[PDB]
Amino acid sequence: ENLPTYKLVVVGDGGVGKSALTIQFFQKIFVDDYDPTIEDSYLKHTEIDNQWAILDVLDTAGQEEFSAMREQYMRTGDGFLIVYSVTDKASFEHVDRFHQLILRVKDRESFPMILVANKVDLMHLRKVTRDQGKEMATKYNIPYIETSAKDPPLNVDKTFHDLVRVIRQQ
Ligand SMILES: Nc1nc2c(ncn2[C@@H]2O[C@H](COP(=O)(O)OP(=O)(O)O)[C@@H](O)[C@H]2O)c(=O)[nH]1
Numbered sequence: 305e306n307l308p309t310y311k312l313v314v315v316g317d318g319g320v321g322k323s324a325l326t327i328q329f330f331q332k333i334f335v336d337d338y339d340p341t342i343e344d345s346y347l348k349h350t351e352i353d354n355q356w357a358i359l360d361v362l363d364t365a366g367q368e369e370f371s372a373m374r375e376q377y378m379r380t381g382d383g384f385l386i387v388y389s390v391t392d393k394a395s396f397e398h399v400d401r402f403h404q405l406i407l408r409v410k411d412r413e414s415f416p417m418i419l420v421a422n423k424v425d426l427m428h429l430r431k432v433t434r435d436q437g438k439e440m441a442t443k444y445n446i447p448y449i450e451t452s453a454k455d456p457p458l459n460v461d462k463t464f465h466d467l468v469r470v471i472r473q474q
């Protein structure tokens with residue numbers, strides 16, 4: 305058998321939940337104080353839709369100019385999660401920056417990605433509606449998913465699996 309690696313890159317503004325989502329996925333715990341500047345990668349064999357793969361995931365953090373790993377992951381990544389927080393309108397607006405960046409680096413008209421609206425467990429603080437998120441995803445022609453990394457987590461496994469599905473379906 306030829307077991308593929310899917311290199312997945314988690315991008316988005318600071319504070320949106322990239323680390324919490326990634327740690328929830330790999331460790332099944334909610335970490336609420338993960339250093340905003342620390343970048344980690346994760347590697348594991350896992351089975352998605354009854355097909356084995358290796359996932360190599362970068363949880364991006366801090367400045368690109370100080371990152372050892374960023375350049376290679378951006379250039380060679382197979383898919384991207386673009387994460388915003390529904391409580392941070394600027395983070396939602398900035399999705400367009402990440403969308404443009406990915407298409408520029410990958411040098412293609414489209415590329416595997418999912419729009420991830422995180423922190424949907426929060427009601428009072430929510431500033432970006434579901435419909436605003438879904439319309440943005442429609443504009444980019446990419447999937448839209450709502451998540452919460454807080455216990456009990458919502459759609460965390462599904463988000464990573466769905467990105468693999470997009471890669472497989474392209
Ligand atoms: N309520 C809630 N808080 C979250 C969620 N995801 C992350 N957080 C919190 O938001 C803050 C930033 O999360 P973090 O994962 O470090 O963001 P990052 O900078 O994108 O890596 C932390 O205090 C987390 O506990 C979520 O789904 N719901």
Ligand SMILES: [Mg+2]
Binds near residue numbers: 324338339340342363
């Ligand atoms: Mg982080």
